Structure formats: C-alpha cells, structure tokens
Amino acid sequence: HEPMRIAGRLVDTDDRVEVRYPWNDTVVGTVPAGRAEHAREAFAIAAAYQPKLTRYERQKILLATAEALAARKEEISDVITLELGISKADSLYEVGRAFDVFTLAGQMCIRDDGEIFSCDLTPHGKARKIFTMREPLTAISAITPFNHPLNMVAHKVAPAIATNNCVVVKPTELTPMTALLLADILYEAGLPPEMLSVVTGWPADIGMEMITNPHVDLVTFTGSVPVGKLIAANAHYKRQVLELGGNDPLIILNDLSDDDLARAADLAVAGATKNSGQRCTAVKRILCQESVADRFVPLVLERAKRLRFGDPMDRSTDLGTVIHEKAAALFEERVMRAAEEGADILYHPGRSGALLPPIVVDRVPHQSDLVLEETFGPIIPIVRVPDDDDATITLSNSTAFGLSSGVCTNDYRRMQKYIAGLKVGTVNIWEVPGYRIEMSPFGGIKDSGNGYKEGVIEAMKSFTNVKTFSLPW
Amino acid sequence: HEPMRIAGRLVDTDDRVEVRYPWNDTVVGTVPAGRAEHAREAFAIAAAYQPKLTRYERQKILLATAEALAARKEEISDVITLELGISKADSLYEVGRAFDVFTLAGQMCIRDDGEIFSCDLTPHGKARKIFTMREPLTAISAITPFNHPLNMVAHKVAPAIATNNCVVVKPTELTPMTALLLADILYEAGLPPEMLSVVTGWPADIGMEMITNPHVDLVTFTGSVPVGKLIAANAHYKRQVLELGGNDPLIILNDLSDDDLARAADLAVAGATKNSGQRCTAVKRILCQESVADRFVPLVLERAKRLRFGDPMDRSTDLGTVIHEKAAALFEERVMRAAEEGADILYHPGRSGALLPPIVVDRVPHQSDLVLEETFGPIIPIVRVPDDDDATITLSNSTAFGLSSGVCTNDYRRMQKYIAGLKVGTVNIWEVPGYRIEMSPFGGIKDSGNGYKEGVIEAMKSFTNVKTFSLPW
C-alpha cells in the first residue's frame, strides 16, 4: 500500500487502485485513486518553487541516485517484476538502463552549450556580441506507460532535475509502484522535494489535469497513438513531446553468409522477445529476403527454443509474462489469424494466462493483423520479402509508424541505401532497432511521434527556454 | 492585378481581394480570392516533389535571390510602402533585412551540424558509433502578418529552400503583393517552382486548409495572439512554431549620466516608432526609474518633435501611417484614456486617418490599456518606475507577454541582474528590444509564442527531421 508522493509528502485518498501481479493475478499493492485536485496541488507547488541548485549540486543528486539504483537493484527489480511480470533478468536489465540515464544526466550537468554570435556581419552590422543561455520552465507534466516502469520515469525526471525544473509524474495505474519508489530514492539522494511529485489514479479523473493545468509549460508523454491524440487535442498552447508506438523491422539482406545468418538470428530473437516484446522499438517484423529465408528460419527456430519462459521471479527465466492475460490472448489470436491466412506456426508450446511463449511464425503476411496491429508481445514473426531492395524498403515504409529499424548486411552500398531510404528516426546496422545509448537522440516520425527528439541530451534542451542577451563590443 | 503563384503557374479566380494604400485608402492592387482547392493543389504539388538540390545549388539560388533583392530594392520597397503605408525609409530598411535573411541562409548551406557518438560508455556499452543526419519534411505551411510583408515571408521561405523543403505561403490579405513578387524573384533565381507556392484569399476561405492539409508536417505562423491560439486549437496534431506579439520594455536605470540619458532617449524614440511602431519587438513601454525621469523625459520629447510624419512616399518622411484608420483610432483612444487615468500627454499634433504622429505620453499608469496591452503603433509612452531594480523587474515582467527587452545602464552588477531576471527571450544591453541579427535564435515565451526559436539557423533546424544511424566499430 503506497500513497502518492507530493513534493516529499505522502498524500492518500479513500478509494484505491489495486495493482496485480500478472503471473498469478494476486494483488501486490494499492495506490490512491487520485483526482484532479491532487495534480492541481502538485503543479501549484512545482510552479511556486524556484530551484537554485548549482550544476555541481544537481550532479551530486543524480549520481547519488545512480549509485542508489545500483545498490538497491534486487529490491527495485522485484518491484518491477511484481507489477509488470517481466523476468528478473529483464527487470535487472531495466535497472541498469536507469543507472545509465542518471549517470549520463549527472555527467552532462558540467556542460554549457551556450553560443556566441559576432554581430558585424552584414551592412546592418553592429559592434556587438550575442550570447545564449538556458533557463528552466514553470512546471513539467510527465505521463508514462507500463513498458518500463522505472526507465520511462527516469528518462522524464533525470533531465528535469539536471535542468532545475519541477516535474509532476503520473505513471500508468498498471505499474505505479516503481515510480513511487524512485521518488523516495530521489528524495533520499537530496532532491529538493518540491522538484518532484508522483501522483496516481484512474485516467478519467486525474489525467486531464495533467494535460490542462495552467502551470504546465510542457507535457512529455510516452504511450499509444489514441492517447497521444487525446493529449494534443487538450494541451492546446503547451509544448509537447510525444513518443507514440513503433512497428520496427529487422531486415535481413541476401548477401549474408550462413555464419552471419546465425548472428542475425540471435538479433531477431533477442529483438522480438526482450522485455517480453514490450518495447516501442521491439522487433515486430522480421523482413527476410526470400533467397536466404530457408537457411535463416531454422536458425531462428533453434534459438527461440533455447529460451526459458515461465516464472518471472525465477532467476533462470529469460522470458516472463506480458502485461496481462487479455493482451496475451489477443496476441495469440493474431497469431492464429495469420496462420489462417498462410503463415506457418513453427513453435507454439502453448499459452498459460498472461504467459506467452516466444512463438515463431514463418511466412507471415505483411498485411496480417499480427504485424500491422501493435502486437506488443514476444511473437517472433518472419515476413519473407523480395530479393529486391527497392521493394523491401517500400514494404518496410508501408506502416503508419516510423521509429527505429535494424539492418543486417555487409554490403556498404546497400547499407547506405537503407540508411537513406528508410522512413524512420533511427537505422541500426547489425543491431536491433531498440539499440541506443541513453543520451543519443531518440524519436520517430509519422505516427511514432510529434516530431521532437528525446534521450538525455535532447530532453535537457527541450526542458529549457533559450534566452539570448547582447552587449556592446 | 496579381494572380496567385502555384508552383510557378499563374492562377486566377473570378472573385478578387482589393489591396488598399493606407495613406489614401485607394486601391493599388488586386489578388485572387483563393479557396481551399488552391491551397490543396499547392500542398499536393509540394508533397509529391522531392528536391534533389545539392547544397551548392541551394546556395546559388539563395544568393542570387539576395543579389536580386539588392538590385531591386527600390522597386520592392515601393510595393511594400504602397500596401502597408510605412515610410520609404522603413520599407527600404526592410528590404535590407530580407537581403540579410537570404544572404545568411545561403551561406549557412555549407554547414553540416551532424554529430557523432561513441557507444562504449557504460556497462551497457558496445563497440559502435552513432551518427546524426538531417532530412526535410513533406511540406511546410507558412502564414504571415502585415507588418513585414517581405521579411516575414523571407524568414519562412529562405530556411525552407536551404533545407530542401517545399513551402506554401499564405500572406495576409492586407499585404499580399510583396509576397507574390518575392516568389517571381525566387523562380527567376532558379528555384524549382514546386518548392514554392504563394496563395491568397480571405482566411474564411483558405485559412483552414493551410493548417489542416494532410501533407503539412509543420505550420510556421507569425501573427496575433487570438489567431495564434485558434491555429493551435485547429492544428491539433501538427508541429507548430508560433511567434506572437510582444510588449517589450526599454528600461532606463538611474546610474546614467545626462549624456547617457540622451543616448537612451535616441533609443526610446527609434525603438518606439520604427516601422510605425508595428513590430512584435517595438518599444511599447519606456520604463524610466523615477530619479532620472525629470531629466530623461524632456530629452525624449525633443527627439519625438523632430520626427517627420506624413506621406510615406516622400523621402523626407521618417514615420508613415499605421495599417488602417481603425488601428490608428484605437491607439489614440488608449492614449486619451491613459490621460483620464493620470497620464500626461506631452505631444499630440493630431491624428489624420491612418496617420498617427509620434505621440509622447508621460506618467502612464502601468495598468492602463495603453501599456498593459500591446499597442501596435508609434506611441512613445513613459512609465515611471521605482528606483528599485527588484520592483522594476517585477513591473517589467507583469504583462502577458515575454519577447524582448532593452536595458540602458553602465553598472555591470545591475546589467547582470536584469539579464537573469527579465522573463523574456532576449535582453539587449544598450539597444532596442528589436535588435538581432537575422540568424540568431529569436522567439519569446508566455503569450509571445509557443516556445520555439526561429531566425535562420533555428528555423533551418526546426524544418528538418534528425535521423540517426549506427555502425559496427
């Protein structure tokens, strides 16, 4: 049972939201059914507090947070696993990503990207210099999905701290406990409490306040397209950074040797199944060029079968559950429709509740629901595509999304072609689409986002206003 | 009579919009009453056309356009003065600004701001490099106001061309002819016609298509606050850069010598009257610290009285008309109401239609409509403020606007204090709020805009998507 964290205080309500363990559906915790007044209260506090931390002080807090995450990693990943259902292997990995987020944010504090312009440049010139600097906003509203109950919150909060902002976070009601814990850790690491609140509740009573509150200068959101559209509809004049789904391909080109085909197969399986397939950058489509398909698919099947799937608290488990059973059943259903339609199910040892095997499907129709819907699970779907790059690129670009991509080839000419021709925010050569460092620019185009980059560095810039000043020179 | 320019094609309608010279309300031209279908065609052409121009070729076009603007400055300035009514002195200066816009955009074509990241940085590190690249959007929608019929269009179009974008401009129906001429100049300079259309019409016919067309990746708008907020609400799901009004102060600090008070007075009069005061960044509030005001105000009055206001085609005219009679009358009434509220009118030769003299009012109450709200005219209003910087800064920050500012002082400590404390996008020491180079970051906060910077460099960046790619290393 965990109250909201509002600027360092615990705030509770009568009604409550139960949080269930997807493995066995038992209640693992409860959080308040917060309402519009609770967000309003947090934003009032954020707006009134003017952080004065030095860069050094911000770095200290962020690095202390990093070391706290490292020291408490077993405790933290337990909380993540118990509400999300991913394996401890995946939970622990997520703690390691959050460790990178805070470490990199702390280290980026020493950097001032201010610029200087000379003004004697044209006939309208003057003997003068212009200098630039950055200032924080009034308040930031952060809304996060169930995907990475820790890292998603880390990415929105660490850069706000690094830039002297005050942030209010509303994590999903499905996985709020990890966020409330991160708040505790931040407070203990020395964060001035007014700089962070974590509120909880049903979307129908508190979500609107997160979007419309008058003190909010910026809304940063990660989640689904429909909800993204609700945000943009209601957050009229406010700055927004929206990261909406992906539908990312791993593309296997026909120049690969058998040995490389095996390495690509490792990529395909990891990419399709890491975090139980629940990543905006998960491999959702393996586009295998026809002429290597017969050699490639078996290698994939063999790797998928080595995957241990079951009790997420078991330290041996590779693959835990998805977010709930309703999601698990739906994905399996899409796998069945695809088979109706021509696909060959090569491995499906059967579903139990929210536990999904790393199902292997070959000859997946590119237009099947399995691929075109967001099948946010550990399905390993192989689409056979033409031994023609123009056709492959066209197919790859044919969804409403454009987030990331991975391409396996040794032909530079082809590499260039895909890098240039794929309509996405990121093209990874010889890596899964989800590969990035926590501080490089991250974001997509089309339905995947509203056109702004995140990641630690770009987030820090987005969370500030540039102010210029000029002096006689 | 000027047709629209749709990708190089002259396109007419039966209905017309009359363009009138504010000096004598006579018709100086006519443009089509364009409809949704015209904008829709323009956008379809924009989206279908993939510019292949090298950086060299873009630079060539941009620099040839600059040369043409300089060669034709008098001709272009004539068109500006005939539709806006600002003096030839002011319109010639505007052509000079557009000259800088095109020159600097052409010269920025050589710059590749791509970044490189090493990936071996944390326990999650890989032997890999990430590289960064920029790509253009599908189509850009640009909506411009009456106050710089040439330069506002130049600022939206030069960076689009510089980035291989395709832009559709809808200039205000009050001053559309300057925009149509710039288009002709661009096509002649070698711009592929598909990269630029200029459409015209009443907002009720064509305005919605500008902000709602499916090919539009970005709306860049400069105009009034109410229209801006209406655009923000109807352009829901699109990227927007909105640059709105200002209410910018010129602050006179009590450390100044009498010699310096005279230099400050020169800035006060120029900044409040240049372009007939029709600038987002015009001096609209002269905040004079009480203990120098008795010495400062006579110096302002003396300078105001020297200004020649009248026929804008007369080359001896300093100050032309404002945009129309309705505007001028509104501004005068605010002056009169300020006086019934305690203000002292020191100079008011009388208004003739759209021609307003450079009215000087002292002891203006900071709450009067004259200064609390944006007065887009050549008024010279002195607000006496305490000899207390904290109080002065609070007063300065107390409007709904936050764009630019000027501060006259020689005390570094105080200079620093204002630079840090004014809630604005730009602080100019010893210059008018309006001073900038055409390529420095420009943009305000609060009601002055939605929080994104423009100017040539920042516009170039906003007009692209950043793609990253990563390679084994």
UniProtKB/Swiss-Prot annotation, chains A, B:
Q: What is its EC number?
A: 1.2.1.-
Pathways involved: Phosphorus metabolism
Q: Which residues form the active site?
A: E243, C280
UniProt-annotated binding residues for substrate: R97, H148, R279, C280, T281, R436
Tell me which SUPFAM superfamilies the record gives: ALDH-like (SSF53720)
Pfam families per UniProt: Aldedh (PF00171)
- Any idea which positions bind NAD(+)? T144, P145, F146, K170, P171, T172, E173, S224, E374
Q: What is the effect of changing R279A?
A: Decreased catalytic activity and slightly decreased affinity for phosphonoacetaldehyde
Coiled-coil region:
none
Q: What does this protein do?
A: Plays an important role in phosphonate degradation by catalyzing the NAD-dependent conversion of phosphonoacetaldehyde (PnAA) to phosphonoacetate (PnA). Has low in vitro activity with the related compounds phosphonopropionaldehyde (3-oxopropyl phosphonate) and glyceraldehyde 3-phosphate.
Quaternary structure annotation from Swiss-Prot or TrEMBL: Homodimer.
What does the sequence similarity comment in the record state about its family?
Belongs to the aldehyde dehydrogenase family.
Protein name stated in the entry: Phosphonoacetaldehyde dehydrogenase
